Design an enzyme around this catalytic site. Structure first.
Site, mmCIF file in Angstrom:
data_model
loop_
_atom_site.group_PDB
_atom_site.id
_atom_site.type_symbol
_atom_site.label_atom_id
_atom_site.label_comp_id
_atom_site.label_asym_id
_atom_site.label_seq_id
_atom_site.Cartn_x
_atom_site.Cartn_y
_atom_site.Cartn_z
ATOM 1 N N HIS A 62 103.875 18.639 121.839
ATOM 2 C CA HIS A 62 102.918 18.166 122.850
ATOM 3 C C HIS A 62 103.626 17.816 124.148
ATOM 4 C CE1 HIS A 62 100.979 17.061 118.892
ATOM 5 N NE2 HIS A 62 100.113 17.900 119.425
ATOM 6 N N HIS A 92 108.195 9.752 127.927
ATOM 7 C CA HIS A 92 107.861 11.174 127.961
ATOM 8 C C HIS A 92 107.109 11.437 129.249
ATOM 9 C CE1 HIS A 92 104.326 9.092 126.400
ATOM 10 N NE2 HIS A 92 103.660 9.993 127.104
ATOM 11 N N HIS A 94 103.968 14.073 131.314
ATOM 12 C CA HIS A 94 102.874 15.043 131.305
ATOM 13 C C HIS A 94 103.022 15.828 132.600
ATOM 14 C CE1 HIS A 94 100.762 12.702 128.113
ATOM 15 N NE2 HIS A 94 101.430 11.721 128.694
ATOM 16 N N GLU A 104 98.067 12.482 134.688
ATOM 17 C CA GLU A 104 96.927 12.029 133.910
ATOM 18 C C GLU A 104 96.071 11.084 134.732
ATOM 19 O OE1 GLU A 104 98.482 10.960 129.919
ATOM 20 O OE2 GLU A 104 97.643 12.938 129.468
ATOM 21 N N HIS A 117 105.701 8.356 131.470
ATOM 22 C CA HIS A 117 105.201 7.220 130.696
ATOM 23 C C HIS A 117 106.340 6.577 129.937
ATOM 24 C CE1 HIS A 117 100.879 8.982 130.621
ATOM 25 N NE2 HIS A 117 101.185 8.390 131.763
ATOM 26 N N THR A 196 96.702 8.165 125.678
ATOM 27 C CA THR A 196 96.069 9.351 126.280
ATOM 28 C C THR A 196 96.148 10.594 125.384
ATOM 29 O OG1 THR A 196 98.015 10.122 127.477
ATOM 30 C CG2 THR A 196 96.593 8.522 128.650
HETATM 31 ZN ZN LIG Z 1 101.825 9.834 127.983
#
Ligand SMILES: [Zn+2]
Length: 258
Positions: A62, A92, A94, A104, A117, A196
């Site tokens: 992911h 991590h 996104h 996000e 994050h 999330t």
């Molecule tokens: Zn995250």
């Protein structure tokens, strides 16, 4: 066979297995800067990462997680809206397929190229697994990335990505200093939300920094070479691993600054 970020298994589908996806305090949200309320009673934010011990970097199919030793208060987040001490467990990102998307949270509907994050758990709950079952169990420090000049403190991460291309691959990742990923200013917005990603648990105090960090086009291009798939499977580039903004509902975003 499970959740992801494609048309067939993406965010619009998650509510079927995870009904909390339509819950009372879901993340991310759009931060409307002209609706957020300055709160003069917010204490200064305290980022204490001096004794941080990174251990490993993992492609989980992911995103990738840089994991830390959280067996003691080695790297902690305190202050701001937080009551008590929150221990860093992992960070991590996104990111998008293009520079104009990937974050996000959004700011006045603006999407950034990526979002970092830094995940912390409330030590009063003893372990991460117990903390995620509490309304104040986690604190996630969110930091926007824009594409411009290179971020030197990010390069060690970028260079190891070749070694964790596919789902399930990990590499030793000791002696990484997460302080190198912070912007100058710690001005922030804060609101109560959720994870999330599935299971979308409603256990997060979000602290989203106003100032983005800049990373180079070359750095983000290397994020985009990662794979969602495992080794020896058809290539699915790891891109657009972001959940879109969710309704704010009955919540207030507070600002640490005017
Ligand atoms: Zn995250």
């Amino acid at each position: 066979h499970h959740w992801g970020y494609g048309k067939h298994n993406g965010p619009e589908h998650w509510h079927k297995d995870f009904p909390i996806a339509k819950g009372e305090r879901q993340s991310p949200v759009d931060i409307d800067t002209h609706t957020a309320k300055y709160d003069p009673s917010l204490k200064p934010l305290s980022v204490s990462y001096d004794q941080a011990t990174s251990l490993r970097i993992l492609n989980n199919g992911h995103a990738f997680n840089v994991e830390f030793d959280d067996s003691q208060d080695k790297a902690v987040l305190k202050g701001g809206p937080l009551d008590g001490t929150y221990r860093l467990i992992q960070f991590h990102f996104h990111w998008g397929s293009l520079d104009g998307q990937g974050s996000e949270h959004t700011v006045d509907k603006k999407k950034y190229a990526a979002e970092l994050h830094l995940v912390h758990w409330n030590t009063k709950y003893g372990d991460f697994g117990k903390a995620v079952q509490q309304p104040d169990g986690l604190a996630v420090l969110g930091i926007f990335l824009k594409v411009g000049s290179a971020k030197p403190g990010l390069q060690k991460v970028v260079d190891v990505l070749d070694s964790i291309k596919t789902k399930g691959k990990s590499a030793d990742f000791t002696n990484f200093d997460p302080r190198g990923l912070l912007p100058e200013s710690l001005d922030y917005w804060t609101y109560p939300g959720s994870l999330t990603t599935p299971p979308l648990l409603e256990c997060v105090t979000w602290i989203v920094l106003k100032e983005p960090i800049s990373v180079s086009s070359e750095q983000v291009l290397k994020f985009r070479k990662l794979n969602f798939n495992g080794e020896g499977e058809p290539e699915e580039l790891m891109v657009d691993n972001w959940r879109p903004a969710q309704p704010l509902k009955n919540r207030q975003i507070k600002a640490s600054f005017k």
